[model samples]
Target: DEEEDDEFEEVADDPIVMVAGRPFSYSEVSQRPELVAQMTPEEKEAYIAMGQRMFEDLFE
Candidate 1:
């Protein structure tokens, strides 16, 4: 006998959130501009926007 647990899962309602350039979960950004930029998210969509940050997790 063996015990197993598949941690991988998918929540249909939940989706990845891209803010500025950072990758965030639905709870952090909700995948909406207004919702994310409430505190100044800095989005320069001319061609690209890579403002600046110490924590570089912005692989969106």
Candidate 2:
């Protein structure tokens, strides 16, 4: 079952994709400053806390 599931995944790593003449890349997501500006200070803190809780739960 795992092997069958793995076969369904797309392995192509082609870069420089275009959508409506705009480019997109998952690897460049962390470098986007707009993402940070989209969230409020309280929401950012909540997201960090959620990540910490996830790490703690995974380790325990």
Candidate 3:
């Protein structure tokens, strides 16, 4: 337990993670090119759809 305190830990509940100087939700950052290179086209489409829904829900 003492050693664990010295280890760097990320905030689990943080809604945003930084990537290339931008802050994006885990769901959003997970789609970053380097990370999503292996994701299927269908997965990308669904991710985009969910992002769109979140945008509309928040702004419209």
Candidate 4:
């Protein structure tokens, strides 16, 4: 039981984003700024199109 508690403490120190008290992994958080900076103009347009479609689907 002591060893298990230590293991849990290690995992608890990992980077996380808290949303309304829910823990989200660091990678799960959006990296849009970094991604956008690397994208070509065409890629940016495509990304926007995909986002729009996803948003529309949410309301359907």
Question: Residue 4 in model 3: shift from native, Å?
Answer: 48
Q: Write the per-residue lDDT of candidate 4 for residues 1-60, one digit (tens) a residue.
A: 345444322233434444333444434435535655455676556555655654673542
Candidate 2 lDDT over 1-60, as tens digits, reads 345444434375634322223454423423665644554676445435544654674542
For 1-60, candidate 3 gives per-residue lDDT tens digits of 356556744464535444444445666656566745444566545546665655774542
Candidate closest to the true structure, highest lDDT: 3
**How many residue pairs clash in model 2?**
0
1-60 in candidate 1: lDDT tens per residue? 766874756365534445557555545553354655543434333112322331255465
User: What residue pairs are clashing in model 1?
Assistant: none
- The all-Cα superposition gives candidate 1 an RMSD in Å to the true structure of 10.2
Listed in order, each prediction's TM-score against the native is 0.29, 0.36, 0.41, 0.41
Would you list the C-alpha lDDT of every candidate in the order shown?
A: 0.44, 0.46, 0.54, 0.49
Off by over 4 Å in 3: 1-32
| lDDT rank order | 3, 4, 2, 1
Higher-TM-score candidate among 2 and 3? 3
- Cα displacement (angstroms), candidate 4, residue 60, comes to 10
Clashes of each: 0, 0, 0, 0
For candidate 1, the TM-score is: 0.29
